[PDB]
Amino acid sequence: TGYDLSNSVFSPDGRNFQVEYAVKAVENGTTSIGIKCNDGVVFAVEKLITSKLLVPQKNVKIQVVDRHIGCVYSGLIPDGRHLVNRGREEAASFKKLYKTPIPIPAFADRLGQYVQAHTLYNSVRPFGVSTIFGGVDKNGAHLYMLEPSGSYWGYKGAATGKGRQSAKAELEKLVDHHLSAREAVKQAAKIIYLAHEDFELEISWCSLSETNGLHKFVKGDLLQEAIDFAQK
Amino acid sequence: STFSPEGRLFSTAIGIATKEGVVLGVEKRATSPLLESDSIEKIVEIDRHIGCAMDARSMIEHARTAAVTHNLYYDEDINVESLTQSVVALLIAGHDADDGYQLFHTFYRYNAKAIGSGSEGAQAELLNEWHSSLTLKEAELLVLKILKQLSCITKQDGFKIYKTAELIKEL
Amino acid sequence: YDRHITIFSPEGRLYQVEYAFKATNQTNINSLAVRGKDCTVVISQKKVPDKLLDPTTVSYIFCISRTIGMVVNGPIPDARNAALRAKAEAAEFRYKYGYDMPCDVLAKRMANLSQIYTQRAYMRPLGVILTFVSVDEELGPSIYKTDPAGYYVGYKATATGPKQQEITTNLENHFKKSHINEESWEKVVEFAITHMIDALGTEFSKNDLEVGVATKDKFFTLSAENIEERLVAIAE
Amino acid sequence: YDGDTVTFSPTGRLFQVEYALEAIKQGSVTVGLRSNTHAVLVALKRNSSYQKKIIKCDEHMGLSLAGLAPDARVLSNYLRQQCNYSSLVFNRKLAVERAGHLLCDKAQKNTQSYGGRPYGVGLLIIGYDKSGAHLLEFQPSGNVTELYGTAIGARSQGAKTYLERTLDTFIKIDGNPDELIKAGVEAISQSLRSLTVDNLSIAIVGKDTPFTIYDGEAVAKYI
Amino acid sequence: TTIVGVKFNNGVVIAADTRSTQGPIVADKNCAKLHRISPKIWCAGALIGSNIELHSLYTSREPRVVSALQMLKQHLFKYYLIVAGVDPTGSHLFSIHAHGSTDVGYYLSLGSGSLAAMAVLESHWKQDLTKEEAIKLASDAIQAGIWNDLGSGSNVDVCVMEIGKDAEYLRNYLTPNVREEKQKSYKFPRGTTAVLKESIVNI
Amino acid sequence: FSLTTFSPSGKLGQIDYALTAVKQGVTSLGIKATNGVVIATEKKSSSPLAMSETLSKVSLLTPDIGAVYSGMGPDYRVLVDKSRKVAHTSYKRIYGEYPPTKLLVSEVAKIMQEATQSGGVRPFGVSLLIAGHDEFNGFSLYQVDPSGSYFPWKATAIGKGSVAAKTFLEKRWNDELELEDAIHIALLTLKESVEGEFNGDTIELAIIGDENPDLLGYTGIPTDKGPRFRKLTSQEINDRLEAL
Amino acid sequence: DPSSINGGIVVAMTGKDCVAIACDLRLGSQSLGVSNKFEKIFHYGHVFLGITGLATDVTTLNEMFRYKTNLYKLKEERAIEPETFTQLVSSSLYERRFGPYFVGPVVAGINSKSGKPFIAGFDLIGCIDEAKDFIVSGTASDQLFGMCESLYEPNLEPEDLFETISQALLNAADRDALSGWGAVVYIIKKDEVVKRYLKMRQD
Amino acid sequence: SIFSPDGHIFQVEYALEAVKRGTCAVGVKGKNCVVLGCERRSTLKLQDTRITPSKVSKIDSHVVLSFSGLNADSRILIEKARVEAQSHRLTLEDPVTVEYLTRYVAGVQQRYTQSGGVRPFGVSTLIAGFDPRDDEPKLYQTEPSGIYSSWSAQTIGRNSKTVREFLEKNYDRKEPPATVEECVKLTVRSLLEVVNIEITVVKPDSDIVALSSEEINQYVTQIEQEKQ
Amino acid sequence: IFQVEYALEAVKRGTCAVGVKGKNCVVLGCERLKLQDKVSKIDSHVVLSFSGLNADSRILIEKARVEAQSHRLTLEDPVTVEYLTRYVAGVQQRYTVRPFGVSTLIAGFDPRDDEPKLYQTEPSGIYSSWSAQTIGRNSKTVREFLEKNYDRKEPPATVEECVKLTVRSLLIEITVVKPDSDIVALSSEEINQYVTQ
């Protein structure tokens, strides 16, 4: 206490407390996960039903960036939208300067530099979201996960939110036992359902073969197959 | 620039709005006989058909600038309710062709309103005294009455400051 | 308020800079750099706590330039900020002065930025210690290390991390008994790994180490498969 | 930790944002609901004249406010600016979803940068476009929710519960604006603890209906 | 102006004439056209030094000729020269076209006498010139410009930069145009000039 | 807002704290002679593996002026960079000659004073001994403090051992000192201050003395002088220690 | 041509241990002669500056250099020397190079420490032209160049230096349409300066 | 740099204290000259006295400025005053009056007590000199608050109270000092009340002379034998 | 605002200034160590007097003078006393890191007019017109004297009467302002004759 009331201050331990409080804010968010398959990535998120009055399929949470990057986040949803808006600006600027779409690791670095910059100055607040994002580019599928600190790493599978631990317990089993995109969607649904222990399951994915490397949402028959597999 | 945990951010002018015109009145309350009474401009014109009874000077300058700008841009008189927003406790009174005579005090329209330390009793006296059939004469005399316990806006005269001795004698 | 912004305390100390020093150890990984006859080697512990991480991405060794490499001790966000700034400075030098930035020039420029953070109260110091390695076109193999206070100096060999003193003690003993005299960069890499093992008393797999080698006209990082060959050669 | 909008609390909450949300509970109730064809706003004005709680953005969209009215004016003027820009650059009626997202992204700025304060007003936006009738709920935190029906402001929980129970009914009201308005006025009623022709305010927009506001005698037939 | 640079087996030599002209009028008969950028980097033509020295102090390294070339060309591009010198990477000889373009050469010439000097350079330049041969060649090219071009005259300045040692600047290396003695002395007798007022000035 | 402010007693607090930082600094000294100035300092090291030859605590500002410091090294580095920059742009590019010691010292004091009066910046935690030569004032030695105040000295010391060093210099210093005797006295005073190992690698000396045309780097311009500032090499210091 | 609007000429010569600087006094609007009292020679201590060219620029530079040399003397506690002042003038002309002053300066003085003559000029390229014999400037520069080149001889005594420079100025001014209406000659010595007004053609 | 509840500005008062801790300065204007004085404080053996600058600084050929307080701030004020004195000539071709330069310095000092992000100058100044083409002396004071005043004699810095009491009962308004000798005598006497002197005499036609150590020595000998 | 009230305290410590306007002129009087040896013209027709921090009065007076000349430069007509008072008040408002610790009496005549004008400004930036006013230390006492010795229905008729009232109120420098840019400060001996009488 005393060193945690401002964003630019180190405590005697060398820890920045405002970033850790932003992590606490992330822990309150709903569970969202990402899974990397042999040729793509899959995104899923637990959308809690606040009331029966919400239109049941139009409060989209997973966001696309450019055309090949998908982003899902947990925590302060408006901060996630702010981060995704910055990511879209970065990707558009890269495509303007360079006609190739922004590589996924390059995009991850741009977002990490932006998020970390919010941990430098006292006049700004850290992002209250951990963002799973990824896509398919010229060199395969990439899955990343930001932290409010600006830290990020590549992952074989990622989870964050209130149920992040339960979801990780199943991501570890997936990696140990394997995972193609078709099976990846069903396993993502299973992981979300298991970690939830009303809600709407939203799924998305980008695979080189099954989407030609473009990010698409799971809808209709495939979504229902994933849901019944999860119920099974 | 902060909210309280309960969610809320951390003289006497009397006006009566009649259908024949609005009347405003103020207690000059000069500090001494030396002060030039003429210089107490506590009722001011904002536009040809708008005036107010009271940072004051700056706000009044910006209100006048906005009103004249609207007149220049549209060749029309600014609606009082629009002015309140586009623009001390205020009584803003004026006329327009949309809703006619108005008086405002976040701004809420009023049929009649009092501000200042006497507001808490003048409000009850207004509630007991105000009625729709008031003609400008009774509106003036009732302004004076509630002061005891001038200016007007009309379509023919516009905003003007009062004569005054006579209306006091008629009280 | 002398402990919250970079201003002098009655002792003349800058407590914020000293706390930024504490932050450098919070990643809990040790690294060391040694100079060979004609090449420079950097060794760093790649501690990976989570099985879901892609180890390819976990890395604190940066290729600043064709010739300069940088290893960072401290939080990865600040480390990446420093690496990006160093890459930008090296490119700007190559542009303005027509030749590759020397390693020591880059270290001085980075230490000057660090000192600026220690002088302007609006900006906090980065909790990173930067170690630049290269084979300079003039001075040969070089190690330069910059710290949050804006201090830097060249090294014969250096270590950084929680167990810095033990590694430095081992290197001091070897330098007393003996640069590292070897004929190819593989042998000096094996020597550096051997002394890392001995000082830390912990065997390493190909997953536990990240290695960067600075040679003439190239700084490159060893893949896990190359570190596997090096560990095998040590086992022999 | 609650002194400014930049400080996270140790539990991870932004106290100033929650205080701004509490500011809305001080405002009078407003209700919103829709079928596929029509969307309706019903507002309890409070006085003196009853301040107008409805704001018209376009022939195809409009909104109502709860809480600090100046923030409502700012957000509504920004919404007009965006709609006019869209019609200026594309001749495209700005979609209700995109307008809601613009509000979301604008208000979130005040919750992260120092020197500003969150907008202490919650808005209900109704509109009609190529996707049909829409209803959005805006909050000071920046969150925007697309809803079948909702109520915001003081004691709105009663109206919200009534809308929850009635949802099975009023979703089926296609091409019958009067029945939707009746359901809305009934819903707002449960938030009282009454309605007069001057107190009540109603607005509607839909397939044939351009956005219109009923005040005075116009609302008499619905009370 | 006549400026030549001649790279030789262990260094580089640049030379110039010493005539400055205001149209057809010789303003300065002994203008020094070889300018130091640093101790071993010199330039000639037809801020950079101070910045080069500051950067040398900052980096604690001997200036590169490439650094001077880069800075000078970037300065001219923002808003002809021969820059020659020796640095740890050897001896260099660059030319800058004041609109921004640069090139490397083994022998160069600039100025109005550039063609007359280049004729001599083409005729006599060869690989593996010794220091003395290169000085003689540069001097001969400058002399050709002097004799054959109206904008070049007076004397020859030479600067020799050899890799292993310090640069030697030879001010007025040759003085072939020394003036003959006048036929008469034009000394006036004192009192020839008519004076109106005489005063002492309080400096 | 200003970080350096007057206390009720009239003292500037941050200036006192910066002077304390200086008093914790390593000892450095300068001695003015009839025919030169010697400025010396000892070099502690972060590790035995650190190459102390990479850091020079005595730096050239102009070929006739050199500075040594006591206090915070990074502050000295940036302040020396600024001093060189201003000595070139604000004097030499204007007048064609390097500034005299008095004017360059005034400009360094200006830089240090601005940090003492500008908002959002703390004072420099260094004191400088600036030794130089100029044609009209001769050899001169100035001390510059964190506040920007500067005074000329015949001999002085700053840092941890300044009191004992100054007491020794008062006894040893006298007129008709030749620069070699000034170097001898400097080495003695520095030896009595260093508790660690004392040799040419732990000690750094530089002198302002005769012009060194051999260090000029070129020949043929008779009117160019050559630096008067010259760092004594490790071997040059060692040979003098072997005759101490 | 802005420099030709007002006309006028300045010439400086070196004697034995002394310097002379001379100028004409005419100020005119092209053909029309306006004033016969517009002296173009200023001193900033023991150093003299003759400025030809556009008269407004002459006045502006006189004011600027008075300012700069007063500040120099206050800061340095010594008077500025002819060489330092030549560098100061050169740098001040450069600071306005884009949108330049239409002037040709001539510095003349004796360095107080070495005590030996100094004269310098500045050409269109901005190059300092420090001369051992004489500097000429103005409209009659050609007339002055020939006249001085014929009359000048080394190591003139002050009384001979006066006659030489005054004859050079008078005969060049007679042949220049825009120069004349009187002349002033300063003879600058270690200890004193003598100012003389010359009788000359008033047409 | 904000008002106290009683209306004083804290930083200005503390800057006045900083001035009061500074070394002494004194000045007396007579019929024909102004004399400025200060005690050398040359008690340190290793101080380079021959090049140590005097307390009195010329701003222009006709004006000198003395000060007491923080030396570093005094140099900033001196340089600004010199630049302004030359700029006035460059704009209108006349030298500054002593009143004009005093007002400029006072305005500079005032501006730092009101502008945010800066602290006051801890320097009070004595400005003495003669107006252009004039012969009556001028003496003025400035202090950190930004106000200035004219004086017939004044002292600033440490022990200013004592020597001001001395001056009040030695300087006579009706018969001010009539010659340079009497002015120097009074200035030396005033400084000797505090327990080596530097004396600067400014005289019309831009005549400014620092009295040599032998000359002050003779003055001090006369004063001392008078004391006996 | 706290800073403005503390500026008012600084004003109230300052030396008192007083002004009285008669039929034809406005008279400004002011209360002025052993070894030490107010009214500022803004334009040829307007004078400004102040009480408070002398240093801040210089900033305000310089800005007022610059505006008085800029008005003539932009509009031919010289400033009116009302306009200058309003400008000075606005300048005082804007600075409220610290306000100006000065209250000002502004007096004079309007261009080609003969009604005397007297105005007051205070650190908050409020301004008002007065027939007679005083500001500064012990201003309350002397103002109370003025309220009973000044008569609204029969104000002073001549320069002698205005000066007499001002001197009595002060009980010294006196400035008399009259139309057609006639501003004069009374001599010491004239003020002495007024005082003795």
UniProtKB/Swiss-Prot annotation, chain C:
PROSITE patterns linked: PROTEASOME_ALPHA_1 (PS00388), PROTEASOME_ALPHA_2 (PS51475)
Major subcellular location class: cytoplasm
Any GO BP: proteasome-mediated ubiquitin-dependent protein catabolic process
Keywords, sorted A to Z: Acetylation, Cytoplasm, Isopeptide bond, Nucleus, Phosphoprotein, Proteasome, Ubl conjugation
Modified residues (Phosphoserine): 223
SMART domains referenced in this protein's UniProt entry, alphabetically: Proteasome_A_N
Compartments reported by the entry: Cytoplasm; Nucleus
UniProt xrefs under Gene3D superfamilies: Glutamine Phosphoribosylpyrophosphate, subunit 1, domain 1 (3.60.20.10)
KW Metal-binding (keyword) present: no
Highest taxon of the lineage: Eukaryota
Per UniProt, location of the Glycyl lysine isopeptide (Lys-Gly) (interchain with G-Cter in ubiquitin) cross-link in this chain: 218
GO cellular component: a single term: nucleus
Other remarks on this protein: Present with 15200 molecules/cell in log phase SD medium.
Record family assignment: Belongs to the peptidase T1A family.
Function according to Swiss-Prot or TrEMBL: The proteasome degrades poly-ubiquitinated proteins in the cytoplasm and in the nucleus. It is essential for the regulated turnover of proteins and for the removal of misfolded proteins. The proteasome is a multicatalytic proteinase complex that is characterized by its ability to cleave peptides with Arg, Phe, Tyr, Leu, and Glu adjacent to the leaving group at neutral or slightly basic pH. It has an ATP-dependent proteolytic activity.
Protein name (database record): Proteasome subunit alpha type-1
Source organism per UniProt: Saccharomyces cerevisiae (strain ATCC 204508 / S288c)
Swiss-Prot record, chain E:
The keyword Hydrolase appears for this protein: yes
Recorded family membership: Belongs to the peptidase T1B family.
Protein's gene: PUP1
Enzyme class: hydrolase
GO process annotations (BP): proteasomal ubiquitin-independent protein catabolic process; proteasome-mediated ubiquitin-dependent protein catabolic process
Superkingdom, natural source: Eukaryota
Subunit and interaction comment: The 26S proteasome consists of a 20S proteasome core and two 19S regulatory subunits. The 20S proteasome core is composed of 28 subunits that are arranged in four stacked rings, resulting in a barrel-shaped structure. The two end rings are each formed by seven alpha subunits, and the two central rings are each formed by seven beta subunits. The catalytic chamber with the active sites is on the inside of the barrel.
Catalysed conversion reaction: Cleavage of peptide bonds with very broad specificity
Main location: cytoplasm
Compartment(s): Cytoplasm; Nucleus
Catalytic residues of the enzyme: 1 (nucleophile)
UniProt protein name: Proteasome subunit beta type-2
Keyword Cell cycle carried by entry: no
The enzyme's E.C. designation: 3.4.25.1
Residues included from the entire protein: 30 to 249 of 261
GO molecular function: endopeptidase activity; threonine-type endopeptidase activity
Note: The side chain of Thr-1 acts as a nucleophile, and the N-terminal amino group acts as a proton acceptor. Present with 11400 molecules/cell in log phase SD medium.
Keywords: Cytoplasm, Hydrolase, Nucleus, Protease, Proteasome, Threonine protease, Zymogen
GO CC annotations on file: cytosol; nucleus; proteasome complex; proteasome core complex, beta-subunit complex; proteasome storage granule
Swiss-Prot record, chain F:
GO terms classed as biological process: proteasomal ubiquitin-independent protein catabolic process; proteasome-mediated ubiquitin-dependent protein catabolic process
SUPFAM superfamilies noted in UniProt: N-terminal nucleophile aminohydrolases (Ntn hydrolases)
GO cellular component terms attached to this protein's record: nucleus; proteasome complex; proteasome core complex, alpha-subunit complex; proteasome storage granule
Crosslinked residue numbers (Glycyl lysine isopeptide (Lys-Gly) (interchain with G-Cter in ubiquitin)): 102
Cross-referenced Pfam families: Proteasome (PF00227), Proteasome_A_N (PF10584)
Entries under InterPro entries matching the protein: Ntn_hydrolases_N (IPR029055), Proteasome_alpha (IPR050115), Proteasome_alpha-type (IPR023332), Proteasome_asu_N (IPR000426), Proteasome_sua/b (IPR001353)
UniProt keyword terms in alphabetical order: Cytoplasm, Isopeptide bond, Nucleus, Proteasome, Ubl conjugation
UniProt-annotated location(s): Cytoplasm; Nucleus
Keyword Nucleus (UniProt): yes
CDD domains according to UniProt: proteasome_alpha_type_2
Cross-referenced PROSITE patterns: PROTEASOME_ALPHA_1, PROTEASOME_ALPHA_2
Record bears the keyword Lipoprotein: no
UniProt similarity note: Belongs to the peptidase T1A family.
Purpose of the protein: The proteasome degrades poly-ubiquitinated proteins in the cytoplasm and in the nucleus. It is essential for the regulated turnover of proteins and for the removal of misfolded proteins. The proteasome is a multicatalytic proteinase complex that is characterized by its ability to cleave peptides with Arg, Phe, Tyr, Leu, and Glu adjacent to the leaving group at neutral or slightly basic pH. It has an ATP-dependent proteolytic activity.
Extra remark beyond the main annotation: Present with 7060 molecules/cell in log phase SD medium.
Listed name of the protein: Proteasome subunit alpha type-2
Species lineage: Eukaryota, Fungi, Dikarya, Ascomycota, Saccharomycotina
UniProtKB/Swiss-Prot annotation, chain G:
PROSITE patterns reported for this sequence: PROTEASOME_BETA_1, PROTEASOME_BETA_2
Presence of keyword Lipid metabolism: no
Bilayer-spanning residue ranges: none
GO biological process: proteasomal ubiquitin-independent protein catabolic process; proteasome-mediated ubiquitin-dependent protein catabolic process
GO cellular component: cytosol; nucleus; proteasome complex; proteasome core complex, beta-subunit complex
Domain of life: Eukaryota
SUPFAM superfamilies: N-terminal nucleophile aminohydrolases (Ntn hydrolases)
Record's subcellular location: Cytoplasm; Nucleus
GO MF annotation terms: endopeptidase activator activity
Keywords: Cytoplasm, Isopeptide bond, Nucleus, Phosphoprotein, Proteasome, Ubl conjugation
Position of the Glycyl lysine isopeptide (Lys-Gly) (interchain with G-Cter in ubiquitin) cross-link: 68
Coiled coil (residue ranges): none
Phosphoserine PTM positions: 29
Protein's job: Non-catalytic component of the proteasome which degrades poly-ubiquitinated proteins in the cytoplasm and in the nucleus. It is essential for the regulated turnover of proteins and for the removal of misfolded proteins. The proteasome is a multicatalytic proteinase complex that is characterized by its ability to cleave peptides with Arg, Phe, Tyr, Leu, and Glu adjacent to the leaving group at neutral or slightly basic pH. It has an ATP-dependent proteolytic activity. This subunit may participate in the trypsin-like activity of the enzyme complex.
Family membership: Belongs to the peptidase T1B family.
Protein name per Swiss-Prot or TrEMBL: Proteasome subunit beta type-3
Organism, as annotated: Saccharomyces cerevisiae (strain ATCC 204508 / S288c)
Gene: PUP3
